Amino acid sequence: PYWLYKLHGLNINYNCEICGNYTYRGPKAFQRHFAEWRHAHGMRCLGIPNTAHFANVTQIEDAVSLWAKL
Amino acid sequence: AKHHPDLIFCRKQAGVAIGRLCEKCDGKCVICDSYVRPCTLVRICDECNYGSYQGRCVICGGPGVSDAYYCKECTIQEKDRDGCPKIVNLGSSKTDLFYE
Amino acid sequence: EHLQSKYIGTGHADTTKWEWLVNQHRDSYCSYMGHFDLLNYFAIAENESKARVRFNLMEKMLQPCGPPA
Amino acid sequence: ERNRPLSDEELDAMFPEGYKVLNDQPSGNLPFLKPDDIQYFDKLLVDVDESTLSPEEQKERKIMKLLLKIKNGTPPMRKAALRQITDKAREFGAGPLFNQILPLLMSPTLEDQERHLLVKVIDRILYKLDDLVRPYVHKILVVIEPLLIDEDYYARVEGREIISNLAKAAGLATMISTMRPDIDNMDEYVRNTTARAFAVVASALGIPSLLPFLKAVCKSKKSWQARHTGIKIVQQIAILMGCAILPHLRSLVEIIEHGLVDEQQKVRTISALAIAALAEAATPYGIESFDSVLKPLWKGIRQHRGKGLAAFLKAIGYLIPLMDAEYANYYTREVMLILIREFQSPDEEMKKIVLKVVKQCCGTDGVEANYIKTEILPPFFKHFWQHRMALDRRNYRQLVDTTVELANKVGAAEIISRIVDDLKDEAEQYRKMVMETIEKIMGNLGAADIDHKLEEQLIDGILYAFQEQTTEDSVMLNGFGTVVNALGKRVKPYLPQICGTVLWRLNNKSAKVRQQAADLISRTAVVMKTCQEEKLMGHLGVVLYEYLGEEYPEVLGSILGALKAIVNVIGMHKMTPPIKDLLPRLTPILKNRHEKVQENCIDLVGRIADRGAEYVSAREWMRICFELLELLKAHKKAIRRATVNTFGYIAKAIGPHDVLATLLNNLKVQERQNRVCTTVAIAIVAETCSPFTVLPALMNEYRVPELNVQNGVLKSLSFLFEYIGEMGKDYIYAVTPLLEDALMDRDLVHRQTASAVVQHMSLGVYGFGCEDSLNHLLNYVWPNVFETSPHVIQAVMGALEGLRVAIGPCRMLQYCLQGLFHPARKVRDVYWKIYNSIYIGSQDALIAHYPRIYNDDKNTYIRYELDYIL
Amino acid sequence: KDPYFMKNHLGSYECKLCLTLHNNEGSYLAHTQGKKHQTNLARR
Amino acid sequence: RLPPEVNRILYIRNLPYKITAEEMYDIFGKYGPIRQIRVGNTPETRGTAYVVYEDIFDAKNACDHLSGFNVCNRYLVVLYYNANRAFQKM
RNA sequence: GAUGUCAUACUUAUC
RNA sequence: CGCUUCUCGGCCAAGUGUAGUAUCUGUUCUUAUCAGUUUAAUAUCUGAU
């Protein structure tokens, strides 16, 4: 259905530079996949621990500065 | 009152004129419109009680019978320290039923 | 609308932080000038009397936070 | 339509079986169009078929169809059309809406209900079209101008409200620009309507906002019509605002003093009427701003005679109580001869002005009673006490007020001896006016001045006025009751003369005579106990006990009121119609469909349950508690308030165990005004007896799988908490898991009832140490603030306003924290409203509960005064 | 024998397949025929 | 000025079964001319009647001064005629 | 999820 | 009509008016970009394309 995909914010391109510049078809889907195993495995390669401060972090250069600031 | 949302109060400077209530609205509060535990009387303003408007009902507007008073829930919530609780404009209440 | 014009210090949905801070500072200055205990504590903290503290609190009511932004 | 004759077939088709006889329709389901209303809705008879033929006027066609459906359609259809036109007033625009509304209201074949609906639509379409009806100000003013001068007071009030809304929406400059060519018009009625609209705009927008415009309009010398319109507008603004023109009295008096010196007598009469209206407002204190007005006015009473002299005499009589004592004495000492010379005036307006000035000329010191009784009262009795004065209401009420003022000034006996002769006349209006004047003289002064030579004549005149009454007015019965209350013990040689005329009035062919006799027995029931008359009351009660079989319900309700008055004036257990043979006698009387008869029966049943509950065998009360559930759902708002007290008295007498099950079984009726009236009765029964006995059963009604029963139980719990108040500290832990479970329901009405119950528990248990359950209920009431229903939002606001006083303003400021600077404006507005309500509830308490804010670069916000410590 | 109509805790009717509410008993019997209930039966 | 609930026909409940047509006509014609009167002759319709008047104002006066009137069977409740309430048995 | 027609049901001691 | 006896029975179609609201039922958008109003962000609208 087009209406259930337009009302729920689906079919909207979002880019995640942390998990290999992956694609996401929803803001709520991106917010749910941020606290997931795939984002934790993508952030574990850079050495950043899985905390609540890096929930809305997308770029690796900003996440590295947020990890060095703490 | 609380039943009609289009009713507005006077909210002027309260003087020494005590409010009055008719026989159809005797015992009911001015704001909460409750009949239990009266705590403080209502003080009307000088513009709402002058000449022919003396001793009239605050809610309805007819001839007053008893003295007007606020409930116990209005005195503790600082609702009696506001302006005059006199209904001035009558909109969508007791106007279409008279023509029908 | 009329609530902000009748009773000052209420605020609305488009109220900035500077006006809210100035209203809170004016309310704190009015509570310090009204209560005798806070004025006595402010006079015991400094070396000035109650009249000098009241004159300093009354002159600080005009823009207590500074110029607006 | 409702009085059209019907044939036998239509009458037979509307009756069920088992009874023995002893194109012209626009586009479908649109309502019936009148043959004279086929001009405004002429574009609706043809089909729309909107395809490459739909301009912006096609929305105006839908707006005209909605107006036609709201004008003569169904009231649900009218409500749907009003909801469609109020929510879409900004998208439709004020232009086509005004262009469709203005010729519809200007039709010569309209009605009162259609004009009222058009005025209601114009008032509801004025709140969304603010600052947009400025070119349509004159087109709305030309339709709202004859509404203020109408006969009905409701239409005039609606026109005044519409003019105030138009003045509030169009500002001050647009109304002054629109009302500027409407002052020098040729039509006098249109000029008076424009002056009334200008006075309404000045009352709605402030007096100094239109004071220099009115001063420029009054001081301009081009024609007498503009000055007359300005003086009429000033007089209407003085007569509309009573005590609001008192700070602006000098600025109006300085403009009014320029008049009454011109060659035109109409402008002088208008200036004198404006001065009288301004002195009317300043009735006790107008002299201060009037010393420049006393000199040309009084010479106008001396140099000329006519209507202007009558207006100057009215202005003098209005300004005379507003001056000093010596000035009022010097004014009344030189105006009594002019009042006596104007007693033979054939004009009705001059006679009315003289009767109005005679009440104010003798109201203080200076005027002796002997000179007023010698030279003022015989010409007032010979020239004003006629038959033509009682016809008009404005000429009867002013004459009655002047007679009451003359009786208060001179004496009550001198007026009674002159007004007792007109009580046995052949006219009903003059006798009613004389009875009202006698009742006012008895209520104000009294009956102590009346000797024994006039009291019997007055009682005979009152009996002749009551026995020869043709209307259904209660003035004669109230006058007889006032005479019996003012007489006191002086009516002891009158009770066989009166009551013997009462029972003889009880047996007649007419139906209103028995009701009038019962009303006279009910009004003279309190005068029998104070005069040591107990055998007559015991005979009248036994007579009225058999008088409950009158076929007229209007006489039966009056007989029930007389029986209630006899039971109130005498003892409850000492009545010759005793309660053992009256309470079963009233049990079939309670099933009457009338309003006043059932109200009197419910009042008598409540009095018998409160004062005589030991006169039954405890089985008829249980059978009357089931008939009390049918006493509700009546459009009178009085019997439903006494039925709950009667149910509470029955629960206090027979025990709160049988009436509670009857109240809980009647909770599922799915009808309005029947479940709230039973919840209030259950709350009154829980508040009269111990509420703990009603504690598990009210917890049982929420266990039934019904929404209406759960809502009625929650409303009964909220009403019981509001009636208890400080006694709710012991019943809060039992109602806490009920309120915690009712707030998590999907239904918004149950959440609003739980919020109201939490508000009642917070307002009742404030200052008792119950802030633990209130903080638990606030955590569930806080997600209910984001509702879209206004009733649920008002219940949540009342719960927040009740919990801020109970749990403290610090907890309310902590719960409202981090929401004032929210990104979403729909939550930010609710948070700003909650913060404004918390500031209006307790502003000084928010100083210690304010959070710490760090200082910025340019401005500082850290409180250094409270951060310091000694 | 409809396995989708259930009774709620407020004395109403609930269609679990389309997840719809109905106040009276006459609205649950009129909700079985329609565009949404047929699509929910065809999808399930 | 009249509410839309009033009509030319008025129903009466809990009427005495031993009442004759003359007494019912005398009770009905006190407020004006009565056009028709139908009394129930069924066990499911006993104690009820329908009185239709010629004038709407006379019918409103009869409804105002006939409700819960004195009657042997019981209070002579006189309610307004409704189309949906009269056909409730069907 | 929204719209515009229809029906059902609920709330404010409204009359 | 009065008194006595037997038997039977009683007592201690609830309407209309006003304000607000939650559900089905009959329906519509796979238009690719660009700029703007708006929205917390979507959605929607205006243009140009």
CSV table of C-alpha atoms in Angstrom, one decimal, chain D residues 169-478:
chain,number,residue,atom,x,y,z
D,169,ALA,CA,-12.7,42.4,15.2
D,170,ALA,CA,-12.6,45.5,13.0
D,171,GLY,CA,-10.8,47.7,15.4
D,172,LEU,CA,-11.6,51.4,16.0
D,173,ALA,CA,-10.6,53.2,12.8
D,174,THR,CA,-12.7,51.0,10.5
D,175,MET,CA,-15.9,51.5,12.5
D,176,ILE,CA,-15.3,55.2,12.7
D,177,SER,CA,-14.7,55.3,8.9
D,178,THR,CA,-17.9,53.2,8.2
D,179,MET,CA,-20.1,55.1,10.7
D,180,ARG,CA,-19.0,58.6,9.3
D,181,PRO,CA,-21.5,59.0,6.4
D,182,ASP,CA,-24.2,57.3,8.5
D,183,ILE,CA,-24.6,60.4,10.8
D,184,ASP,CA,-25.9,63.0,8.3
D,185,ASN,CA,-28.4,60.6,6.6
D,186,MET,CA,-31.9,61.7,5.8
D,187,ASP,CA,-33.6,58.8,7.6
D,188,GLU,CA,-34.1,59.4,11.3
D,189,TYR,CA,-34.4,55.7,12.2
D,190,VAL,CA,-31.2,54.9,10.4
D,191,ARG,CA,-29.5,57.7,12.2
D,192,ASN,CA,-30.7,56.5,15.5
D,193,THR,CA,-29.5,52.9,14.7
D,194,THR,CA,-26.1,54.3,13.7
D,195,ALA,CA,-26.0,56.3,17.0
D,196,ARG,CA,-26.8,53.1,18.9
D,197,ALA,CA,-24.2,51.1,16.9
D,198,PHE,CA,-21.6,53.9,17.7
D,199,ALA,CA,-22.6,53.8,21.4
D,200,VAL,CA,-22.2,50.0,21.4
D,201,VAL,CA,-18.8,50.3,19.7
D,202,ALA,CA,-17.7,52.9,22.3
D,203,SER,CA,-18.9,50.6,25.1
D,204,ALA,CA,-17.1,47.6,23.5
D,205,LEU,CA,-13.9,49.5,22.7
D,206,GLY,CA,-13.6,52.1,25.5
D,207,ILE,CA,-14.8,55.6,26.0
D,208,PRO,CA,-11.5,57.6,25.3
D,209,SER,CA,-11.0,55.6,22.1
D,210,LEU,CA,-14.1,57.3,20.6
D,211,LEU,CA,-14.1,60.5,22.8
D,212,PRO,CA,-12.3,62.9,20.4
D,213,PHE,CA,-14.3,61.6,17.4
D,214,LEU,CA,-17.6,62.2,19.3
D,215,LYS,CA,-16.2,65.6,20.4
D,216,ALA,CA,-15.5,66.5,16.8
D,217,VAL,CA,-18.9,65.2,15.7
D,218,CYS,CA,-20.6,67.2,18.5
D,219,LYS,CA,-18.8,70.5,18.1
D,220,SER,CA,-19.1,70.6,14.3
D,221,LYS,CA,-21.6,73.3,13.1
D,222,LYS,CA,-22.9,72.3,9.7
D,223,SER,CA,-26.4,70.8,10.4
D,224,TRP,CA,-28.6,70.0,13.4
D,225,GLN,CA,-28.9,66.4,12.4
D,226,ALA,CA,-25.2,65.5,13.1
D,227,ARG,CA,-25.4,67.2,16.5
D,228,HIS,CA,-28.6,65.5,17.3
D,229,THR,CA,-27.1,62.1,16.3
D,230,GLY,CA,-24.1,62.8,18.4
D,231,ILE,CA,-26.2,63.8,21.4
D,232,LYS,CA,-28.3,60.6,20.9
D,233,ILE,CA,-25.2,58.5,20.7
D,234,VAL,CA,-23.9,60.1,23.9
D,235,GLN,CA,-27.3,59.5,25.6
D,236,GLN,CA,-27.2,55.8,24.5
D,237,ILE,CA,-23.7,55.4,25.7
D,238,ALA,CA,-24.6,56.9,29.1
D,239,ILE,CA,-27.7,54.6,29.3
D,240,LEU,CA,-25.8,51.5,28.2
D,241,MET,CA,-22.8,51.8,30.5
D,242,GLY,CA,-24.0,52.4,34.1
D,243,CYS,CA,-20.9,52.9,36.2
D,244,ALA,CA,-18.3,52.8,33.4
D,245,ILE,CA,-18.8,56.5,32.3
D,246,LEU,CA,-18.0,57.8,35.8
D,247,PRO,CA,-14.2,58.5,35.1
D,248,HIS,CA,-15.2,60.0,31.7
D,249,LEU,CA,-18.1,62.0,33.1
D,250,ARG,CA,-16.4,65.4,32.9
D,251,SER,CA,-15.2,64.9,29.3
D,252,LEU,CA,-18.8,64.0,28.3
D,253,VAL,CA,-20.4,66.8,30.3
D,254,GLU,CA,-18.1,69.4,28.7
D,255,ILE,CA,-19.3,68.2,25.3
D,256,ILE,CA,-22.9,68.1,26.4
D,257,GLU,CA,-22.8,71.6,27.8
D,258,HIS,CA,-22.3,73.0,24.3
D,259,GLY,CA,-25.8,72.0,23.4
D,260,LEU,CA,-29.2,73.2,24.6
D,261,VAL,CA,-28.4,76.8,23.4
D,262,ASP,CA,-29.0,76.4,19.7
D,263,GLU,CA,-32.1,77.4,17.7
D,264,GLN,CA,-33.2,73.8,17.2
D,265,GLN,CA,-35.5,72.5,20.0
D,266,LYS,CA,-34.8,68.9,19.0
D,267,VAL,CA,-31.1,69.3,19.7
D,268,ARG,CA,-31.9,71.0,23.0
D,269,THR,CA,-34.2,68.1,23.9
D,270,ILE,CA,-31.5,65.6,23.0
D,271,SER,CA,-28.9,67.4,25.1
D,272,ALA,CA,-31.3,67.5,28.0
D,273,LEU,CA,-31.9,63.8,27.6
D,274,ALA,CA,-28.2,63.1,27.5
D,275,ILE,CA,-27.7,65.2,30.6
D,276,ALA,CA,-30.5,63.3,32.3
D,277,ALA,CA,-28.9,60.0,31.3
D,278,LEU,CA,-25.5,61.1,32.5
D,279,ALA,CA,-27.1,62.3,35.8
D,280,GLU,CA,-28.9,59.0,35.9
D,281,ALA,CA,-25.6,57.2,36.0
D,282,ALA,CA,-24.2,59.7,38.6
D,283,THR,CA,-27.6,59.7,40.4
D,284,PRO,CA,-25.9,60.3,43.8
D,285,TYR,CA,-22.8,62.1,42.6
D,286,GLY,CA,-23.3,64.1,39.4
D,287,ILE,CA,-23.3,67.6,40.7
D,288,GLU,CA,-19.5,67.7,40.8
D,289,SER,CA,-19.4,67.6,37.0
D,290,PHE,CA,-22.6,69.5,36.5
D,291,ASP,CA,-22.3,73.1,37.9
D,292,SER,CA,-22.0,74.4,34.3
D,293,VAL,CA,-25.2,72.6,33.4
D,294,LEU,CA,-27.6,73.8,36.2
D,295,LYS,CA,-27.7,77.4,34.9
D,296,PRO,CA,-29.1,77.1,31.3
D,297,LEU,CA,-31.3,74.2,32.2
D,298,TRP,CA,-33.4,75.7,35.0
D,299,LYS,CA,-34.0,78.9,32.9
D,300,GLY,CA,-35.3,76.5,30.2
D,301,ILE,CA,-37.9,75.4,32.8
D,302,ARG,CA,-38.7,79.1,33.4
D,303,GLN,CA,-38.6,80.7,29.9
D,304,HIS,CA,-40.4,78.1,27.8
D,305,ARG,CA,-43.0,75.3,28.1
D,306,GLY,CA,-43.5,72.1,26.2
D,307,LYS,CA,-41.5,69.0,25.6
D,308,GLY,CA,-38.1,70.7,26.2
D,309,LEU,CA,-39.4,72.0,29.5
D,310,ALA,CA,-40.4,68.4,30.4
D,311,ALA,CA,-36.9,67.2,29.4
D,312,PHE,CA,-35.3,69.9,31.5
D,313,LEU,CA,-37.6,68.9,34.4
D,314,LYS,CA,-36.6,65.3,34.0
D,315,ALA,CA,-32.9,66.4,34.0
D,316,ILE,CA,-33.4,68.5,37.1
D,317,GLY,CA,-35.2,65.6,38.9
D,318,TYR,CA,-32.3,63.3,37.9
D,319,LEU,CA,-29.6,65.8,39.0
D,320,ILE,CA,-31.3,66.8,42.3
D,321,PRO,CA,-30.4,63.6,44.3
D,322,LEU,CA,-26.8,64.0,43.1
D,323,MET,CA,-26.3,67.3,44.8
D,324,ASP,CA,-26.0,68.6,48.4
D,325,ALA,CA,-28.8,68.9,50.9
D,326,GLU,CA,-29.2,72.7,50.6
D,327,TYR,CA,-29.0,72.6,46.8
D,328,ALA,CA,-31.6,69.8,46.7
D,329,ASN,CA,-33.9,71.8,49.0
D,330,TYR,CA,-33.5,74.9,46.9
D,331,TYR,CA,-34.2,72.9,43.8
D,332,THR,CA,-37.3,71.2,45.3
D,333,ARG,CA,-38.6,74.5,46.7
D,334,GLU,CA,-38.8,76.0,43.2
D,335,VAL,CA,-39.9,73.0,41.2
D,336,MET,CA,-42.9,71.8,43.1
D,337,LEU,CA,-45.1,74.6,41.6
D,338,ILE,CA,-43.9,73.5,38.1
D,339,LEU,CA,-44.8,69.9,39.0
D,340,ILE,CA,-48.2,71.0,40.3
D,341,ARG,CA,-48.9,73.1,37.2
D,342,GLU,CA,-47.9,70.2,34.9
D,343,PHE,CA,-50.4,67.8,36.6
D,344,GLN,CA,-53.1,68.6,34.1
D,345,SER,CA,-50.9,68.0,31.0
D,346,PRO,CA,-52.8,66.0,28.3
D,347,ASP,CA,-49.5,64.6,26.9
D,348,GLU,CA,-48.6,61.1,28.1
D,349,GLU,CA,-44.8,61.7,27.8
D,350,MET,CA,-44.9,64.8,30.0
D,351,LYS,CA,-47.1,63.0,32.5
D,352,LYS,CA,-44.7,60.1,32.6
D,353,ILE,CA,-41.8,62.5,33.1
D,354,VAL,CA,-43.7,64.2,35.9
D,355,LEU,CA,-44.4,60.9,37.6
D,356,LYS,CA,-40.8,59.9,37.3
D,357,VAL,CA,-39.6,63.3,38.7
D,358,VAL,CA,-42.1,63.2,41.5
D,359,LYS,CA,-40.4,60.0,42.9
D,360,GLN,CA,-37.1,61.8,43.0
D,361,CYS,CA,-38.4,65.2,44.2
D,362,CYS,CA,-39.4,63.7,47.6
D,363,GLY,CA,-36.8,61.1,48.7
D,364,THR,CA,-34.8,63.1,51.3
D,365,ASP,CA,-35.1,66.0,53.7
D,366,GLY,CA,-36.5,69.4,52.8
D,367,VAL,CA,-39.9,68.3,51.6
D,368,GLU,CA,-42.4,68.3,54.6
D,369,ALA,CA,-45.0,65.6,54.9
D,370,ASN,CA,-47.8,68.0,55.6
D,371,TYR,CA,-47.3,70.1,52.5
D,372,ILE,CA,-46.9,66.9,50.4
D,373,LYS,CA,-50.2,65.6,51.9
D,374,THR,CA,-52.0,68.9,51.4
D,375,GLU,CA,-50.9,70.2,48.0
D,376,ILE,CA,-49.0,67.3,46.2
D,377,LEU,CA,-50.9,64.1,47.0
D,378,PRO,CA,-54.5,65.2,46.2
D,379,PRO,CA,-53.5,66.4,42.6
D,380,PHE,CA,-51.4,63.3,42.2
D,381,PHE,CA,-54.4,61.2,43.2
D,382,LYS,CA,-56.8,63.1,41.0
D,383,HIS,CA,-54.6,63.5,37.9
D,384,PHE,CA,-52.7,60.2,37.7
D,385,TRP,CA,-54.9,57.6,39.3
D,386,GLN,CA,-56.9,56.9,36.2
D,387,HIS,CA,-57.8,53.8,34.1
D,388,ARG,CA,-55.6,54.6,31.1
D,389,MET,CA,-52.4,54.6,33.2
D,390,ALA,CA,-52.8,50.9,34.1
D,391,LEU,CA,-52.9,49.8,30.5
D,392,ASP,CA,-49.2,50.5,29.6
D,393,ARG,CA,-46.6,48.7,31.7
D,394,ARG,CA,-44.2,51.7,31.7
D,395,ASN,CA,-47.0,53.9,32.9
D,396,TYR,CA,-48.2,51.4,35.6
D,397,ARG,CA,-44.8,50.5,37.0
D,398,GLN,CA,-43.6,54.1,37.3
D,399,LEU,CA,-46.9,55.1,38.9
D,400,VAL,CA,-46.6,52.2,41.4
D,401,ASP,CA,-43.0,53.3,42.2
D,402,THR,CA,-44.1,56.9,42.7
D,403,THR,CA,-47.0,55.7,45.0
D,404,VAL,CA,-44.5,53.6,46.9
D,405,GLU,CA,-42.2,56.6,47.3
D,406,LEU,CA,-45.1,58.8,48.4
D,407,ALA,CA,-46.1,56.1,50.9
D,408,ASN,CA,-42.5,55.9,52.2
D,409,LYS,CA,-42.2,59.7,52.4
D,410,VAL,CA,-45.6,60.8,53.7
D,411,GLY,CA,-47.1,57.7,55.2
D,412,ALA,CA,-48.6,54.3,54.5
D,413,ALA,CA,-52.0,54.9,56.1
D,414,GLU,CA,-52.7,58.1,54.1
D,415,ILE,CA,-52.0,56.2,50.8
D,416,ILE,CA,-53.9,53.1,52.0
D,417,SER,CA,-57.0,55.1,52.8
D,418,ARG,CA,-57.0,56.6,49.3
D,419,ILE,CA,-56.0,53.3,47.5
D,420,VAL,CA,-58.4,50.9,49.3
D,421,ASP,CA,-61.4,52.3,47.4
D,422,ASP,CA,-60.0,51.1,44.0
D,423,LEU,CA,-59.7,47.5,45.2
D,424,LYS,CA,-63.3,46.6,44.4
D,425,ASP,CA,-63.4,48.2,40.9
D,426,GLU,CA,-64.6,46.5,37.7
D,427,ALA,CA,-61.2,46.6,35.9
D,428,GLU,CA,-58.6,43.9,36.4
D,429,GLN,CA,-55.5,45.9,35.6
D,430,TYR,CA,-56.3,48.8,37.9
D,431,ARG,CA,-57.2,46.3,40.7
D,432,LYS,CA,-53.9,44.4,40.1
D,433,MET,CA,-51.9,47.6,40.2
D,434,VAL,CA,-53.7,48.7,43.5
D,435,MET,CA,-53.0,45.3,45.0
D,436,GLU,CA,-49.3,45.5,44.0
D,437,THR,CA,-49.1,49.0,45.5
D,438,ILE,CA,-50.7,47.8,48.7
D,439,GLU,CA,-48.3,44.8,48.8
D,440,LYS,CA,-45.3,47.2,48.3
D,441,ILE,CA,-46.6,49.5,51.0
D,442,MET,CA,-47.1,46.5,53.4
D,443,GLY,CA,-43.6,45.1,52.6
D,444,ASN,CA,-41.7,48.4,52.8
D,445,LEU,CA,-43.5,50.4,55.5
D,446,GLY,CA,-45.8,47.8,57.2
D,447,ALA,CA,-49.3,47.6,58.6
D,448,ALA,CA,-48.7,49.4,62.0
D,449,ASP,CA,-50.1,52.7,60.8
D,450,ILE,CA,-53.3,51.1,59.6
D,451,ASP,CA,-56.0,51.4,62.3
D,452,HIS,CA,-59.0,49.1,62.9
D,453,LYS,CA,-61.3,51.3,60.7
D,454,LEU,CA,-59.3,50.5,57.5
D,455,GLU,CA,-57.9,46.9,58.0
D,456,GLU,CA,-61.3,45.3,57.5
D,457,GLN,CA,-62.0,47.4,54.4
D,458,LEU,CA,-58.6,46.4,53.1
D,459,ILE,CA,-59.2,42.7,53.8
D,460,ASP,CA,-62.6,42.9,52.1
D,461,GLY,CA,-61.0,44.6,49.1
D,462,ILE,CA,-58.3,41.9,48.9
D,463,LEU,CA,-60.9,39.2,49.1
D,464,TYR,CA,-63.0,40.9,46.4
D,465,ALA,CA,-59.8,41.2,44.2
D,466,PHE,CA,-58.9,37.5,44.8
D,467,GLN,CA,-62.4,36.2,44.3
D,468,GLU,CA,-62.9,38.1,41.0
D,469,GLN,CA,-59.6,37.2,39.3
D,470,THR,CA,-59.7,36.2,35.6
D,471,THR,CA,-56.0,35.8,34.8
D,472,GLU,CA,-53.4,33.4,36.1
D,473,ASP,CA,-51.1,36.0,37.7
D,474,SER,CA,-49.7,35.5,41.1
D,475,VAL,CA,-49.8,39.2,42.1
D,476,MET,CA,-53.1,38.9,44.1
D,477,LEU,CA,-52.0,35.8,46.0
D,478,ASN,CA,-48.6,37.5,46.9
